[PDB]
Amino acid sequence: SLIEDARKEREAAVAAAAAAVPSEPGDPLEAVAFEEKEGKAMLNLLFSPRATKPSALSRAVKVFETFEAKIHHLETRPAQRPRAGGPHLEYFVRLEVRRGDLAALLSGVRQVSEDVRSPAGPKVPWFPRKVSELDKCHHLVTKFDPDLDLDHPGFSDQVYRQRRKLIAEIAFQYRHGDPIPRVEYTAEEIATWKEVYTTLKGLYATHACGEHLEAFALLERFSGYREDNIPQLEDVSRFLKERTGFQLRPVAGLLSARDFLASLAFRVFQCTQYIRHASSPMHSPEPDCCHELLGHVPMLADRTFAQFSQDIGLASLGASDEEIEKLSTLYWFTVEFGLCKQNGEVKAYGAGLLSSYGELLHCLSEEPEIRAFDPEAAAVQPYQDQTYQSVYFVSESFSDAKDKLRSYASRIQRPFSVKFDPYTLAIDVLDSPQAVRRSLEGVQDELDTLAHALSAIG
Template sequence: MQVTGPRTVPWFPRHISDLDSFSQKTLDAGAELESDHPGFSDMTYRTRRAAIVENAGTYKFGQEIPRVDYSEDEIKTWGAVYRRLKELFPKHACKEYNQILELLEHNCGYGDDNIPQLEDVSQFLKKCTGFQLRPVAGLLSARDFLNALAFRTFFSTQYIRHHSMPLYTPEPDVVHELMGHAPLLADPDFAELSQQYGLASLGASDSDIVRLATCYWFTVEFGVYRQGEDYKAYGAGLLSSFGEMEWSCAKKAEGEKGPQYLPWNPAVAAEFEYPITEYQPTYFVADSLADATEKLKEFSENQIVRPFRVSYLPYSQSIHTDRLVKRDTYEGA
């Protein structure tokens, strides 16, 4: 009888401290800007970003997240966005978001005159759902970013967009992270949705990582759900963009052009193409955050094929597999 050993799968972290190895694996260097970036020719801005990015490069699991002494101009930029978004939240943001934002204003210094510190927000999230933030220098690969979610860890930038265009950014910045992503990580259903993406990504094939990342785009980034007769935003890309929040959720007059709405179905969404530099032409609509989570769980269990099952052990902050598995060599090793 032929005896075979454990199958080899793509490397994945087994303990939360393994996420330290991601710090130097960003797809961009944080301070390196594209020529069309508003701050490309501003050397003062680029030097400032580089200084903030250093926090991520040296951060290790268990440390306090370094605090940033934001400048007056940076706070003004944050404030301009904050005030504009707050005008829209009561009408277009989901009810969970509005409830949590009030708590963040009371507990973490959210306001138009202050940029919250990642450490304070992270401690708040830990008390609510066990999620935590950690600084990152720039964009991670889809696999690394999703893997971290399995440990209820969200990689967040600390730098802010250029002051010349406060209502626009070509990349994730601290406004997108703290206004878009962080609040709903305090909600149990949304936190479970986010972690489910992470657990499903561990040891998954490259093609399944693409499918999961696409579903993530249509939920955590650009998700809406139906609340009565209205569409409400729960995706970070909508909650941090006043223009697309209105485009996705505002009722359209008869004859007015608007997006297409499809029922949230991960098997369908996973095969969808989407633009990254313009408003989404299609949104997938869940019945609730819990509905979004349950449908993703079913999709992950039935369509993400792996030779093992995983579970997260919160007390040891580690991953358990139900059988022996051999991980491929880590690319960052």
């Protein structure tokens, strides 16, 4: 339903854009996007006048100086000179005018251009830079939003509502760096956990990826994945951070696509503490604690898989809503439902595959269609809800998927790039060569250390 989530997010965004028009029409000056800085407003205007004699842009620049505005950058470059037949007439302005004088001279600039817009298109969808703001803003932007899910199967029990309230309070009031508040579990949830644990463990020897099996074995040895005791979150978070360098974060409510992908970028995984309804233990209408504990968490213990997911998250940064949907679809057809070709046979590592017993049976059956993984194909192919998936993609080696994702991100246009810093666990934008040099200096230092090591050995 995450593709549904991405579609809902993008349609909500476009509706907001569809509602971003002034209530009162009739003003041709309503499309001039501007922002105000230090009492004045900095903005931009583009003109596309045809032919060559009508070059009255002087009047427009006679407008700009009419109020002693602060010009950041004026430029003019008639089109069809660098490329012919694809661009159109344009000339770039960026200027700061007194907010009162801004409209006054924009009235005069209306005497120069009528049928064009500002040259600056979509600037960027905002994204965090460090883990701290990732928690702080995305809890503030996700405040006061309870989940109803009444029409969903079950969820009519008041005790379920109280448990949801408790989980929401724990997650929403949780800050970064803090330890996971331990949550109790009565007999019903632990019994359901025991049932699902037994049913899934008895079949995990089959159809499952060997990495998943070994990760599960190590976790049940250390973290305590047993039918009797449902594991908490702090212990598994510590284990993952220690070995795979990964950690979790409790969350509830309607998570967007963007925040989830940002979390994925920061090598942190959002999670929910409560589990599915006891009336429906075989499947859950919404992914729950057991879903991640058995579908996401185990295969997430792989260093290469974690790196691949992190690369996905990195590519997700600052991407437009369409690209967000594409990345969500790729996640669905790779992480939630992913197939591997190892030891000759095909095994399953998908989270959704590793979270539903019926889907576990169906995935390796011959009824559903299976094909080799393709980034673009997985990014276009649609999904289904409340029904078994019939189309699957297989990746024999996670390295192959990683490099394919590298290529996909490379061909994905962005006005910048993104680098991750595990030292401070931060994100440094890549829009000027100076940051590239800064990163390369550390790269060279690591290379020198490696050379010293190589000299030492032998």
